Design a protein around this ligand. Sequence first.
Ligand SMILES: Nc1nc2c(ncn2[C@@H]2O[C@H](COP(=O)(O)OP(=O)(O)NP(=O)(O)O)[C@@H](O)[C@H]2O)c(=O)[nH]1
Ligand SMILES: [Mg+2]
Ligand SMILES: [Mg+2]
Ligand SMILES: [Mg+2]
Ligand SMILES: [Mg+2]
Ligand SMILES: [Mg+2]
Ligand SMILES: [Mg+2]
Ligand SMILES: [Mg+2]
Ligand SMILES: [Mg+2]
Ligand SMILES: [Mg+2]
Ligand SMILES: [Mg+2]
Ligand SMILES: [Mg+2]
Ligand SMILES: [Mg+2]
Ligand SMILES: [Mg+2]
Ligand SMILES: [Mg+2]
Ligand SMILES: [Mg+2]
Ligand SMILES: [Mg+2]
Ligand SMILES: [Mg+2]
Ligand SMILES: [Mg+2]
Ligand SMILES: [Mg+2]
Ligand SMILES: [Mg+2]
Ligand SMILES: [Mg+2]
Ligand SMILES: [Mg+2]
Ligand SMILES: [Mg+2]
Ligand SMILES: [Mg+2]
Ligand SMILES: [Mg+2]
Ligand SMILES: [Mg+2]
Ligand SMILES: [Mg+2]
Ligand SMILES: [Zn+2]
Lengths: 313, 129, 14
Amino acid sequence: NLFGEPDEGIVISRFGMHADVESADGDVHRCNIRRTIRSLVTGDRVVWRPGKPAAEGVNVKGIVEAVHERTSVLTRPDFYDGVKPIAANIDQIVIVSAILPELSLNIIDRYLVACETLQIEPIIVLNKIDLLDDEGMAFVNEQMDIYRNIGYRVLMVSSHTQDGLKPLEEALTGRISIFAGQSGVGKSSLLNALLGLQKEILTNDISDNSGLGQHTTTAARLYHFPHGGDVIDSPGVREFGLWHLEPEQITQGFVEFHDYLGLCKYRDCKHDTDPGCAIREAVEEGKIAETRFENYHRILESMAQVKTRKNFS
Amino acid sequence: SMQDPIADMLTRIRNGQAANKAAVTMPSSKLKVAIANVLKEEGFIEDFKVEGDTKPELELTLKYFQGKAVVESIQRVSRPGLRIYKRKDELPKVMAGLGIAVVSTSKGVMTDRAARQAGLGGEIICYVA
Amino acid sequence: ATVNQLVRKPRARK
RNA sequence: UACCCGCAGAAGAAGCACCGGCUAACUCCGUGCCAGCAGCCGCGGUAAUACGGAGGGUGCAAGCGUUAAUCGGAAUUACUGGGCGUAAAGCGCACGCAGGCGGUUUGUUAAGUCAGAUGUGAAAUCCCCGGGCUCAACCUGGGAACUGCAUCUGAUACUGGCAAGCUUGAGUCUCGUAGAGGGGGGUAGAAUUCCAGGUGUAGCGGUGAAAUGCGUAGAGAUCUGGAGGAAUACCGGUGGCGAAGGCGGCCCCCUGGACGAAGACUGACGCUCAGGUGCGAAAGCGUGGGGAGCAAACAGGAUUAGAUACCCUGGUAGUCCAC
RNA sequence: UUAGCUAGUAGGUGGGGUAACGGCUCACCUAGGCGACGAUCCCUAGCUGGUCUGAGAGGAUGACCAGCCACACUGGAACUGAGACACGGUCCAGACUCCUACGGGAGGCAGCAGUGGGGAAUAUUGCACAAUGGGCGCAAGCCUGAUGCAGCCAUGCCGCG
Ligand SMILES: Nc1nc2c(ncn2[C@@H]2O[C@H](COP(=O)(O)OP(=O)(O)NP(=O)(O)O)[C@@H](O)[C@H]2O)c(=O)[nH]1
Ligand SMILES: [Mg+2]
Ligand SMILES: [Mg+2]
Ligand SMILES: [Mg+2]
Ligand SMILES: [Mg+2]
Ligand SMILES: [Mg+2]
Ligand SMILES: [Mg+2]
Ligand SMILES: [Mg+2]
Ligand SMILES: [Mg+2]
Ligand SMILES: [Mg+2]
Ligand SMILES: [Mg+2]
Ligand SMILES: [Mg+2]
Ligand SMILES: [Mg+2]
Ligand SMILES: [Mg+2]
Ligand SMILES: [Mg+2]
Ligand SMILES: [Mg+2]
Ligand SMILES: [Mg+2]
Ligand SMILES: [Mg+2]
Ligand SMILES: [Mg+2]
Ligand SMILES: [Mg+2]
Ligand SMILES: [Mg+2]
Ligand SMILES: [Mg+2]
Ligand SMILES: [Mg+2]
Ligand SMILES: [Mg+2]
Ligand SMILES: [Mg+2]
Ligand SMILES: [Mg+2]
Ligand SMILES: [Mg+2]
Ligand SMILES: [Mg+2]
Ligand SMILES: [Zn+2]
């Protein structure tokens, strides 16, 4: 009670019982939330009041009263958790991965399907590239050229080498960015090489396994670019929520497969067991690599196994 | 084991009274005769006989109403683990004076009704309820 | 339960 | 001074808490899970007797509420008067000292107990009948109470001690019967794997499906022969034995308890157990052996979003023996 | 979640000692004493007649009244005297404050009130020897913050308007 000025400010982070709210000038001021708030995410502009200082100059918290409308939203469902938004109000996401512990391609494909339902442009960025040889580097560069023909920009960097950071920053200013990826793919180290942030905490960095990666850093912490825009860190995520829509939207989740629709035999097509699929003819021609097509029906067969029990929002 | 033989005597009475037995037998002693003869003189049982001199065997004749237990319940009060003694004016009654309390004194085994004219106290044996 | 047990140690009042 | 006479006129002299239930009393408006309320239960987001106010009432009273503290309720540390198969709780089991307890008959001691009496338990407080201050509170007369302790005289049924016993308790002998009871030393035959030889050819192996792995140096399969290791099919069953964990090829040796029959014999020699004492599944630890099979960690292949687990091919510690 | 404790310690002789017995004290002699029925160590506490609660058994506590023990700024010691190791007696040391001419001395409200301070919180810097009890004296008489009273504090009980 005894609240202050209603104003607009940016929420830094989410902590359940309370939240960190940046004001209109750069003041870290933690506040709790209103009971009728259905959800509050990282980087959401809100209406809030900074309480009242009990001691003169020493206040504890304020409150966050109301939540503005969403520009974007990142809704990913989960078994026995429901549909939960992670972050919101963003224009660009940067898919960040590393060659260690693994570099999969199925982790790439379903963020592409999600961003086709959010009108966001994801960017493929690889880390830890200084550890390989040029024979190995040319193969990984060859596997990303397929991801270059489909229109997505690919910038391949290294944190301990500071390669390619300057072309990574020129396309990244003026926007907010999620550094999405799995556990231990170099998310925290690339935040250190771009920002120049306060080096006295500077992150929590524990990723040591036998052949795996660890998710030590929590959900999302907000900072600022030296030029403009905001950053959003991501959890180490190994989940895939495809409970949203019909498999017609799975066909829309891929860029180059748009221009090849309406060319097959029948008006409806499963594209795997149906005779005369023109999408399958494009893969056999070589204009589409067969790694994407075998992973394409793996997405559809994953909907034969996730759907089984039931889930609805 | 058989360390309280009076409590063993009360066990054999209470079982056969409830289980419709006509007559019961038990190992005799001097003190068991001095209790059953009092219960014979107080209308709770019928008769007792002695059998054997090298193994004294006491017998009790049961008593019923229409096949109903005359001795409804009986309660051992003092015991070898805890001795109970009262004076001539602290003698407890059973069912406010309906039941009798077997108290052995120097003038033999008698009731608290019989201890009024005797004016003595001692060891409480059982609450004949 | 046994009276002779309470000779060694009485009932511990909380 | 109390007391008392006389004066004037209701004149100088009533409030607080509660009102959903517990727990005595019901309607209305305002507010809108916000504010607040609250000892418990839990009330209030569009009709709240529960919030705020009003109306009216209830319970008390020159006091009324609240907070803190003690006991009661609470049989909720259960002597009166609780439980321990699954609600919290029977030590993993056994031996046994101290301690507690003890069959039956007689005598003795009167120890415990009981009867009587003396002395004592200061007064005040409490209780009984009174008296007094106008009443009550309060003060006070005597009695009772103070269930206590010490001593003397008694009674001997029970408990204790002594004495003599008795045999049903508990033990001892003989004749017997059953048993995977333990320890030690040999020994048998399948099966597993390794190795030697023979005949013999393209897959063996493994799974839901495959792959890792093995094999033309001839695997696998079969047969002969040998080596090592550990376990004992069938019998075999709410079957037996052991204090318990447990214990299983056969045979010998040493050794333990259990049970039955016929009598003879000692005469309560008994029950129980805090500390103490020993046994006590498997894992693991120390030293030195041993090594088939199985198999933490780990190697490798599938699975997968990832596989760390599952599945599969291998594989060390350990499983084996002594200490 | 304290199991061993203890050498004047346990006992004996003799000497000494106080009003009286006694390791109360001293030399010598013995090696015992205490203790799982709690020795010893640590913490806490004045105790009892009682009050309160409870049908009772039990339970919690010890203000006012009365009995006893201990204590009188801290520590130690002795004198005086029938009786003290002495609340308003002394001596020494330490602590604190006061007086001072700088060398020294003075003081003990846990007596009645009363101030400062602590704490949620507890009073007038009153009157009197009229009565009772005590002290001294042959008595008269004197003294008594004991006590008898008064005021403050709805602090409790009881009674009335
Ligand atoms: N050699 C090398 N190491 C790198 C490079 N980038 C990052 N690392 C190392 O990779 C590790 C993982 O980095 P980190 O950013 O903590 O990973 P993360 O993805 O943030 N982990 P989390 O999922 O917990 O948030 C760190 O030890 C970091 O030093 C690189 O370019 N080269
Ligand atoms: Mg990180
Ligand atoms: Mg009512
Ligand atoms: Mg109210
Ligand atoms: Mg309303
Ligand atoms: Mg009144
Ligand atoms: Mg309380
Ligand atoms: Mg109780
Ligand atoms: Mg119970
Ligand atoms: Mg249980
Ligand atoms: Mg058992
Ligand atoms: Mg008295
Ligand atoms: Mg009197
Ligand atoms: Mg009286
Ligand atoms: Mg009267
Ligand atoms: Mg074999
Ligand atoms: Mg004989
Ligand atoms: Mg080891
Ligand atoms: Mg395995
Ligand atoms: Mg070993
Ligand atoms: Mg002497
Ligand atoms: Mg006084
Ligand atoms: Mg006193
Ligand atoms: Mg003194
Ligand atoms: Mg002194
Ligand atoms: Mg003084
Ligand atoms: Mg005073
Ligand atoms: Mg103060
Ligand atoms: Zn098609």
